[PDB]
Symmetry: D2
Subunit: 116 residues, 4 copies
C-alpha cells in the first residue's frame, strides 16, 4: 500500500476506530483537490486509499477528524481536526505510513517512509 | 497575552528560535483571514500576538513553518508545515498556550488553557 | 503475541532497527528479575518475548537501549535509555504492544492493550 | 536553578499540579541515592531542586508519580510511574528543563538544555 494511516488513542490505550480521514492533493491552481477518504477499521488502520499509479508526485494533505471521535466518547476536545501536509514521491515512489496518537488536548504524528 | 506559542526542538534539546508563525481566523465566509504573525525569539516563544479585545470566540489556525527551520539546519524534513486548528470559547477568562515539539519526521502539539 | 515492542525513529522516518530491549519482572523481594530480551528487527518490531503461560500477573519493566542506537548514528543523545513500567494481566490476560517514538532529546511511548 | 521539571496534562489541557517528583543520583556503587524531591505547583513546575554547587556531572534519574495523579482524577492509568534517566555533563554552563506530557496510556518527555 503506498499510503496507510494508523490512529491510536492515548486515553484508552486502544486503536482509534471509525475515525474519518480525508486526503487532498494540491492542484495546479493551488487549491486542495479531493483525493481519497475512508474510516479507520478495528486495528485503527486505513488501507486502500490509492494505488501506486495514481499516487504521483505532489503535495498531499491528510486530515483526521479528531473532533468527531472525541465527541462520540463524551469529551469536548481542543482541536478541530489534525492535519498532516507533506510532499510525496518527489524522488521516486515511496510507501508512506502516517501515524497519529490522539489525546483530547494533544496529538502527535509521525511518518514512516520506506523504499519498495 | 491571551495567545502564546512555544516551539521546542527535539533533535537539539533547545528552544526553536527564528521560527515563522502565522495565525488565522475563520471568516463568516469560510476562508482564513490573517490575524497575526511573528518569529519565535530565543526562548522559543512568540508573545504579543493579540489582545483580549480582539481575541473573540471563533475558530483559529496556527501555522508553524517547520520546513524552513529544518532546512536552515541541514536536515531534510517531512512536513511542509505544522498546523493547529482550534476553537476559542468564552467560558471563563482563558489564556491559550499552543506548544509544539519538533522533529524532522514527527511533531507533537498540546494546548495549555489556564484562567487568570 | 502477549508482549510486542515497536520502536520508531522520528529523525529518519523509519523503524528503529537493531535496538536492544530488556524486560524485567518485579520479584517478591522487590528486585527486578530478568525476564526476556531481544533486538528489534527490520520493521522495528520485537516479537517472541514470552508466552501466555509464562506472562503472569505482575509488574514489568521494558528497558529500551536508546543511547546505543543514537551513538551508532553519530549522535550523542540525552537519555541513557527509555524505561516503561507497568502492571500486566491483573484483570486477566491481555495482549500488550509497547510503542516508542525516539528523538535524540525526546521520546514518546504509548501502550495498546487488547483483550483476546 | 540548574534543574527544573515541568509536567503537563494532555487530557485536560492544564499544568499537572500536585504531582510528586523524586530525583536520584547514581552512586559510585551502582545504586540510586535520593537527591531531591517535591510536588509540582500550580503552573506544573518544580523549582529549587538543587544548586550549581551540588549538581555535579553524573547520571540522574527523575521519577514522576503519574499513577497517583490519574487515580486522583478517576482515570485508570497504564504506567506505574514515568522515569527519565540522563547524564549531566560539564561542557559549558547548562540549565536543564525536564518536561513531561501525560496521558493515561502514553507519555512524552523532552529536555530543554540551555546555557546562561
Ligand atoms: O505501522 C504501525 O503498525 C504502527 C504501529 C505502532 C505505532 N505506534 C506509533 C506511535 C507511537 C507513538 Cl508514542 C506516537 C505516534 Cl505518533 C505513533 O506509530 C505506529 C505505527
Ligand atoms: O520549559 C518550559 O517552560 C516549557 C513550557 C512548555 C512546554 N511544553 C512542552 C511540551 C510540549 C509537548 Cl507537545 C510535549 C512535551 Cl514532552 C513538552 O515542554 C514545555 C516546556
Amino acid at each position: 500500500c503506498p499510503l496507510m494511516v494508523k490512529v491510536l488513542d492515548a486515553v484508552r490505550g486502544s486503536p482509534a476506530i471509525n475515525v474519518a480521514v480525508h486526503v487532498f492533493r494540491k492542484a495546479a491552481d493551488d487549491t486542495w483537490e479531493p483525493f481519497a477518504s475512508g474510516k479507520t477499521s478495528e486495528p485503527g488502520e486505513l488501507h486502500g486509499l490509492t494505488t501506486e499509479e495514481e499516487f504521483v508526485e505532489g503535495i498531499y494533505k491528510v486530515e483526521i477528524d479528531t473532533k468527531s471521535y472525541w465527541k462520540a466518547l463524551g469529551i469536548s476536545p481542543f482541536h478541530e481536526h489534525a492535519e498532516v501536509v507533506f510532499t510525496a514521491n518527489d524522488s521516486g515512489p515511496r510507501r508512506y505510513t502516517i501515524a497519529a496518537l490522539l489525546s483530547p488536548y494533544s496529538y502527535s504524528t509521525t511518518a514512516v517512509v520506506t523504499n519498495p
